[PDB]
Symmetry: C3
Amino acid sequence: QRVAAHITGTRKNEKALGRKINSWESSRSGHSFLSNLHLRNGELVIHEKGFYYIYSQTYFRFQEKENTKNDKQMVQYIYKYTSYPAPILLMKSARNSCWSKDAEYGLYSIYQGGIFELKENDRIFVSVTNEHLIDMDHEASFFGAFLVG
Amino acid sequence: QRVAAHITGTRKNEKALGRKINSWESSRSGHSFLSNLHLRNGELVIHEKGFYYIYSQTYFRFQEKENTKNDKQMVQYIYKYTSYPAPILLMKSARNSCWSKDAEYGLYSIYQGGIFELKENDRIFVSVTNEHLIDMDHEASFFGAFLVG
Amino acid sequence: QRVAAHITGTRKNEKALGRKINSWESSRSGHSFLSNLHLRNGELVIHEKGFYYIYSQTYFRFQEKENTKNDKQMVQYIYKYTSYPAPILLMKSARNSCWSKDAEYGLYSIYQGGIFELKENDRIFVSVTNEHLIDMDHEASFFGAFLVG
Ligand SMILES: [Cl-]
Ligand SMILES: [Zn+2]
């Protein structure tokens, strides 16, 4: 009953790709809440086994050179730690930036989500490429999950 | 029990950004339904307090000049009115249009969603920039929410 | 109780648009599961009437000619078969590829979802344009649904 979380920006050998986001708001601060989940070191930690819809939005935003190709791969990864040594990729979503040499800025919000079976004490996190391009405004970048059954 | 809505196109001082969409289908017309929510002046009005997953898809579609820079910021905003004087932004998602001078058209569907705690009589709405570029086909542009717990 | 599905890549006259994806993983293989739904010929088949949140992510990925305009419309369609002769489009989401002649590749993950009333024995499927550009990695392309009430 009321197993859900929404957390926001604050304004066997295989390694996870990208860079893990660990600056999600860890305080009860309004759009961010936790209910029968908790947050530790940027990971949502599961208390109740079941099917969870898991989602994240990550806002890539940047301002934009002769002989300088500047293509960007903006990728969001959602990973799980369970009782296995390596993190397990659940979902990935990607964009490329505009290739035009006239490009002066880029706005690329990436949303994805999906339903996964999770066990008690599993840990879920978001990682991204180009993390220095992420805008952590609390309405633009966020991560959440809820128990569907 | 059965607290959900999906509504579609028809084919303290701070102000909300963008332009509010108020032309969502207000009739029971098949993909659009309301269940223990209602629609008034383009806003979904909450009857039962709780956690809601709220989402919207807004389709920007357009056809595409010397010395004319024509960059577009296409942004979708999801706002809440509660017992506070100003609307409160919950979520924003943005794209820029292709900067190439060879661009002849643009197709930019923007989806986002997330879980928020809502109170009885809160009102939620969608606003967009460039509203004249939105394609209100009922399968392309829509707004919904459901009680997660 | 536990009516949900997530299926992934494996690594009256009117016709449905695009090409139907029928290569979703049909085995219980970990991120893919079925619970009180089944999969037949690429379609999720409903066992219990009710409101379903339905979603899909489809990853378009490609490498990129004089006098060759190469614009791509990448569209994802989610269709329903019910007790009617023609499939019924529920949701569509579209992108265009970058128009720059400097474009060397394209990464376009498309996610959409929404809530629809479904009947027992309704069938839901995903179709896409440019199907030869879809990357069926199981973390990148997927289709799912869950009963919201
Ligand atoms: Cl572009
Ligand atoms: Zn471009």
